[PDB]
């Protein structure tokens, strides 16, 4: 059963080349109603759905250690994005799908990981990125990686305009190889959905 369909709201994603789902650090969420919001937080399901982002083009010239990152949340022009501008505090986890579509004649390997409290890693530290929740993408085996993570941080609710707890990271483990029958490059995309979205502290309007 390499076939998987994921649903988030009124959006679905179906992949026929998956190696399952990796859950990071936990399988459920910490308590979303703590003392810091005095019972004024509310959930917004209309924001729990997939949004898209191109990460990069995986080409043969990129070597081991080449790293691409996406700090979350990122600019969002839909419901979720509106919440970031209209409420002072928020919390949510992430349902992350990364795809790298070439063909089975390509070779190589990408590491896909979710990193809490991103800091630029030194070359030597890249050898240990597997300490973070991750999966690999190798054209001979899969085109999709899927990671699910909960919200975390020193604070139970956050101000995303000031702090991004999670960072999606894609790193080249072994360079893309090409044949006469393979793809020449692979475009890597992310399909992300925020999960268990809660907001607190409605802000005034700007007009």
């Amino acid at each position: 059963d390499r076939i998987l369909t994921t649903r988030n709201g009124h959006t679905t994603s179906t992949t026929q080349s998956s190696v399952g789902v990796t859950y990071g650090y936990s399988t459920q969420e910490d308590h979303v109603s703590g003392p810091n919001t005095s019972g004024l937080e509310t959930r917004v399901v209309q924001a729990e759905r997939f949004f898209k982002k191109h990460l990069f083009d995986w080409t043969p010239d990129k070597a081991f250690g080449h790293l691409e990152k996406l700090e979350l949340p990122t600019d969002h022009k839909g419901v979720y994005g509106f919440l970031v501008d209209s409420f002072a505090y928020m919390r949510n986890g992430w349902d992350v799908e990364v795809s790298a579509v070439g063909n089975q004649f390509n070779g190589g390997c990408l590491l896909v990981a979710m990193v809490p409290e991103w800091k630029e890693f030194t070359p030597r530290e890249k050898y240990q990125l597997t300490l973070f929740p991750h999966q690999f993408i190798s054209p001979r085996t899969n085109m999709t990686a899927h990671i699910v993570v909960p919200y975390l941080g020193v604070n139970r609710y956050d101000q995303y305009k000031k702090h991004k707890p999670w960072t999606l990271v894609v790193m080249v483990v072994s360079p893309l190889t090409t044949n006469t029958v393979s793809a020449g490059q692979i475009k890597v995309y992310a399909n992300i959905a925020p999960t268990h979205v809660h907001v607190a502290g409605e802000l005034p309007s700007k007009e």
Partner: protein, 190 residues
Amino acid sequence: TTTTGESADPVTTTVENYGGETQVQRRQHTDVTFIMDRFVKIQNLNPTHVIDLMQTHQHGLVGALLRAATYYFSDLEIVVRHDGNLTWVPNGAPEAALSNTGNPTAYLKAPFTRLALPYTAPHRVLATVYNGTSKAQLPASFNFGAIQATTIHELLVRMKRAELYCPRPLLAVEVSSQDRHKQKIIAPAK
């Protein structure tokens, strides 16, 4: 053992696969609370000093293991060698408070002062890295209070009942040798 590497599911094979036998292991020394529970030096000192565990040496036993975690929690013990009386104030206090006796103040008693202090941050846990601003450096609120004396000569900190969350890279010395890092291991004289 043969498995699907891409899924990143942990796989722990054993010597039994080729007829060996797995032995008994005793891991108390790699227990987190235990390993962090020992005094380490702070080093960069001033007569007014804010206790920040990130001032431990990054390659020191405690400093390195601490940086190999993202979030942590602990109470603290400190040993301070100072001239004059030593005053401590909790996380959040105005620096000005360090001058008053109503705050925990330890009167000089040679050779130094050892105290047990509770965690006082306003956060449920602290972090060793923080991806953002609070107004890279860490937020000002990540501390265990501050101490002041006429002169602070030495400061040792000890993490009590430590909890660590979310592992991060931990590095050994890089090797130039091409085979092994070699060093002088202690051996009997003569």
